[PDB]
Enzyme design. Sequence first.
Site, PDB file in Angstrom:
ATOM      1  N   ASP A   1       4.283   0.644  -5.781  1.00  0.00           N
ATOM      2  CA  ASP A   1       3.366  -0.238  -6.508  1.00  0.00           C
ATOM      3  C   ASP A   1       4.089  -1.455  -7.086  1.00  0.00           C
ATOM      4  OD1 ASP A   1       1.428  -1.402  -8.250  1.00  0.00           O
ATOM      5  OD2 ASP A   1       0.517   0.556  -8.602  1.00  0.00           O
TER       6      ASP A   1
ATOM      7  N   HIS B   1      -6.866  -1.291   0.805  1.00  0.00           N
ATOM      8  CA  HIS B   1      -6.614  -2.006  -0.437  1.00  0.00           C
ATOM      9  C   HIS B   1      -5.604  -3.151  -0.287  1.00  0.00           C
ATOM     10  CE1 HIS B   1      -6.528  -2.433  -4.807  1.00  0.00           C
ATOM     11  NE2 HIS B   1      -5.216  -2.580  -4.686  1.00  0.00           N
TER      12      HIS B   1
HETATM   13  C1  HEM Z   1      -5.605   2.328 -10.103  1.00  0.00           C
HETATM   14  C2  HEM Z   1      -5.909   1.192  -9.456  1.00  0.00           C
HETATM   15  C3  HEM Z   1      -4.979   0.520  -8.409  1.00  0.00           C
HETATM   16  C4  HEM Z   1      -3.998   1.060  -7.657  1.00  0.00           C
HETATM   17  C5  HEM Z   1      -3.547   2.533  -7.559  1.00  0.00           C
HETATM   18  C6  HEM Z   1      -3.408   0.008  -6.860  1.00  0.00           C
HETATM   19  C7  HEM Z   1      -2.387   0.173  -5.941  1.00  0.00           C
HETATM   20  C8  HEM Z   1      -1.851  -0.816  -5.129  1.00  0.00           C
HETATM   21  C9  HEM Z   1      -0.883  -0.623  -4.067  1.00  0.00           C
HETATM   22  C10 HEM Z   1      -0.296   0.740  -3.665  1.00  0.00           C
HETATM   23  C11 HEM Z   1      -0.609  -1.822  -3.521  1.00  0.00           C
HETATM   24  C12 HEM Z   1       0.362  -2.136  -2.356  1.00  0.00           C
HETATM   25  C13 HEM Z   1       1.796  -2.438  -2.839  1.00  0.00           C
HETATM   26  C14 HEM Z   1       1.947  -3.751  -3.586  1.00  0.00           C
HETATM   27  O1  HEM Z   1       2.001  -4.825  -2.932  1.00  0.00           O
HETATM   28  O2  HEM Z   1       2.028  -3.733  -4.844  1.00  0.00           O
HETATM   29  C15 HEM Z   1      -1.411  -2.812  -4.218  1.00  0.00           C
HETATM   30  C16 HEM Z   1      -1.435  -4.164  -3.963  1.00  0.00           C
HETATM   31  C17 HEM Z   1      -2.208  -5.101  -4.616  1.00  0.00           C
HETATM   32  N1  HEM Z   1      -3.217  -4.868  -5.550  1.00  0.00           N
HETATM   33 FE1  HEM Z   1      -3.677  -2.983  -6.312  1.00  0.00          FE
HETATM   34  N2  HEM Z   1      -4.052  -1.178  -7.174  1.00  0.00           N
HETATM   35  C18 HEM Z   1      -5.018  -0.907  -8.131  1.00  0.00           C
HETATM   36  C19 HEM Z   1      -5.882  -1.823  -8.712  1.00  0.00           C
HETATM   37  C20 HEM Z   1      -5.937  -3.178  -8.447  1.00  0.00           C
HETATM   38  C21 HEM Z   1      -6.890  -4.140  -8.968  1.00  0.00           C
HETATM   39  C22 HEM Z   1      -8.034  -3.785  -9.941  1.00  0.00           C
HETATM   40  C23 HEM Z   1      -6.565  -5.359  -8.484  1.00  0.00           C
HETATM   41  C24 HEM Z   1      -7.252  -6.730  -8.691  1.00  0.00           C
HETATM   42  C25 HEM Z   1      -8.555  -6.871  -8.975  1.00  0.00           C
HETATM   43  C26 HEM Z   1      -5.416  -5.196  -7.620  1.00  0.00           C
HETATM   44  C27 HEM Z   1      -4.781  -6.208  -6.926  1.00  0.00           C
HETATM   45  C28 HEM Z   1      -3.759  -6.071  -6.012  1.00  0.00           C
HETATM   46  C29 HEM Z   1      -3.085  -7.175  -5.365  1.00  0.00           C
HETATM   47  C30 HEM Z   1      -3.332  -8.684  -5.559  1.00  0.00           C
HETATM   48  C31 HEM Z   1      -2.046  -6.526  -4.446  1.00  0.00           C
HETATM   49  C32 HEM Z   1      -1.047  -7.233  -3.506  1.00  0.00           C
HETATM   50  C33 HEM Z   1      -1.806  -7.597  -2.231  1.00  0.00           C
HETATM   51  C34 HEM Z   1      -0.904  -8.419  -1.366  1.00  0.00           C
HETATM   52  O3  HEM Z   1      -0.864  -9.665  -1.551  1.00  0.00           O
HETATM   53  O4  HEM Z   1      -0.209  -7.833  -0.509  1.00  0.00           O
HETATM   54  N3  HEM Z   1      -5.060  -3.859  -7.624  1.00  0.00           N
HETATM   55  N4  HEM Z   1      -2.143  -2.173  -5.193  1.00  0.00           N
END
Ligand code: HEM
Lengths: 369, 371
Positions: free
Chosen positions: A183, A277
């Site tokens: 993450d 996601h």
């Molecule tokens: C419990 C809730 C969430 C979990 C478990 C989660 C988990 C993750 C994981 C595993 C990744 C891929 C690794 C990384 O690039 O960091 C990711 C990417 C991302 N997440 Fe989440 N996330 C959550 C909620 C959210 C929310 C609410 C938002 C925005 C509204 C968000 C925005 C993003 C963004 C912008 C990326 C990077 C995408 C990219 O440019 O590659 N996340 N998240």
Amino acid sequence: ATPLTSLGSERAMFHGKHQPGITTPMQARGHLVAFDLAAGAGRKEAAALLRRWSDTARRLMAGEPAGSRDTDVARDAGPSSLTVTFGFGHSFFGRTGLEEQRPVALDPLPDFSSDHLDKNRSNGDLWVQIGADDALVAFHALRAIQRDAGAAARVRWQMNGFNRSPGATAHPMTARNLMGQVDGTRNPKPGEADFDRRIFVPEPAWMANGSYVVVRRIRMLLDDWEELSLKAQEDVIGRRKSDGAPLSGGSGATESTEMDLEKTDGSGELVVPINAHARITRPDQNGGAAMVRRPFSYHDGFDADGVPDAGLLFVCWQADPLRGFVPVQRKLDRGDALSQFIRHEASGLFAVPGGAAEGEYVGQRLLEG
Amino acid sequence: ATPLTSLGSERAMFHGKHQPGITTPMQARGHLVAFDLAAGAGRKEAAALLRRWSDTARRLMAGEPAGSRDTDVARDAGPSSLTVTFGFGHSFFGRTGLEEQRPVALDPLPDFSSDHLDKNRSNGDLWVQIGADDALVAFHALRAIQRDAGAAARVRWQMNGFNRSPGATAHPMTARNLMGQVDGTRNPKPGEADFDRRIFVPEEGPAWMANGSYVVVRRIRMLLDDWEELSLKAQEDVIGRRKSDGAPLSGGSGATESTEMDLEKTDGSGELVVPINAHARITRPDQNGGAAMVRRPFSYHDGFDADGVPDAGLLFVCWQADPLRGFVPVQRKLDRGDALSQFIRHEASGLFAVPGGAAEGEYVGQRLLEG
Ligand code: HEM
Ligand code: HEM
């Protein structure tokens, strides 16, 4: 080799162009707290409060005791990378007669269909983020800040969080969350040409070099999540749990390997699913919308049915929520494979101004008479 | 110099004479959990559960994933000094038809006049203590143990705690608590001639408890709003030791935490320098006919109420060969006699029998539970 004592001896700067706690490295311990101004407390009381808070922050971030009547709780520990960050909510401005200075960026977040927000644990006039790599140092800071409020403000809500500790892994690595996912991989990075424009207000004027934070307390439905197969879990995100590599990556791939959003599998299905996601959150899938995510995990116990109150204290940073969290979350609301496995249960949106210069306090340009 | 990576690479033994989590060094993260056996669950189900739990503890304490369906939450981290410790409550024995094997040491604690115990957050059939220096490692273990319970048991209560992290101070030092006091100075120490007899049931009460110990757990809220209104002189009088360095009040400016307390010294007015009701006076073994215990606690903070009162204090965890020669006579005295009593509230309690360590090829509590 980096010495163990570095956990304690490392420190962040309080004074500077930007407030600490934004580009500061992840910390092992976090406290998020919101305060509401007390009845009868207005702009003058708010100015004095931010002045007290800034002085307290300055001292403690250098590993020094509070100015008077220190509890000794952090005595003998170094600064331990302590940071204290201050933000102002939409409601602060009506409370202090400063509506003229309220940024448009603080306009209320949408009422997303998947919201399950506890209003009593949401929003607030003032927000403080405290983080450190030692838990006594972190609590000492929380208590000092909270006691600084005095008759001027009350604690509205307060949440505890945690992350991996320094030294836990053999090499510096991206953090994990309680779903077991890597993450934080694809955050905008300082040094990238568009980083400042994506994250910080350029040099209302009181917000110069500041940023907007969105906080969401997101419960992970671990009881359902952990019943999924590994393949099913990895399809939800579009990245491998073992190393954070894109599912489209070969055996040499890492978390930083580029996604292949076109690649298909033996069945002609997209290798990174269309609802994954880590596909649909990308700036290139949202008209350039971007944010720096800098969260804490949380676990606050179990209910009577044995369901864990555990998840992510999601905290993201951007120059304009309308170019970050908001359009992305509009898409995730019903389009994200992850949505059925999480619950947004509290929310906040705060304006976090530039860092204090020497001799000044945080928010001074806004609050000074 | 000790490398930062030692935080993650350090590991405790699961297999051994005594269970880990008793003489193990203080850890930065703690989770305490109690389970009650499910309807219909008896000795057979309990044996299977402790067997599962022991396998889980063994794998995770070596930094390995769970045997099946691991969550990856602890992946890439070292063992981080993870320990898992298992205990049995008084009620366990009636549930499993093992009343003949119930130690007399598990007889219910007195109902002290200062008790404010939440019954739903107290006691239980089974107790697990999980600690580590990394929070993901600690949570991963908590979730694995809790999920192992399955149809055999339900979570009755669960509390989270914390301590100072390794590396926080320049040199290793005694810990502090949220009242700001030096906490742990006068614990019995391994290697002292009387340590084993004070803390552990001998190798040869019931035989299944050989090399075990009895733990008393108390969730003690600190009344920080009242405590922090006191002068330093008043705070130090409550304990009988200085906050700065942990020295007895009877000590001069050259005194340290290791300086002997002078129990006889009086001031110009003939009153004791270390007050007659001072906590660190009246808790001493020499003030209680030899009663002693090892205190190995966690601090806690679980948020603020509507009035801004912190739900914060000490998860008091103490170890002894016999509660009647440890926690019980001491708390009997502290109840109304301790200057500290006015500033704390006992809000939950547990007393559990913690057997000897699992030998290789065996599980914890096997002598008790095997068919
Ligand atoms: C419990 C809730 C969430 C979990 C478990 C989660 C988990 C993750 C994981 C595993 C990744 C891929 C690794 C990384 O690039 O960091 C990711 C990417 C991302 N997440 Fe989440 N996330 C959550 C909620 C959210 C929310 C609410 C938002 C925005 C509204 C968000 C925005 C993003 C963004 C912008 C990326 C990077 C995408 C990219 O440019 O590659 N996340 N998240
Ligand atoms: C929030 C509650 C408590 C606080 C803040 C507290 C604090 C302290 C402090 C500051 C010391 C002196 C330094 C040391 O030697 O560790 C101490 C010693 C001690 N405490 Fe407590 N304590 C608490 C509860 C208890 C309880 C409930 C018991 C037993 C029923 C207990 C038994 C002892 C003993 C046996 C010692 C060492 C006495 C000696 O010098 O030999 N404590 N405690």
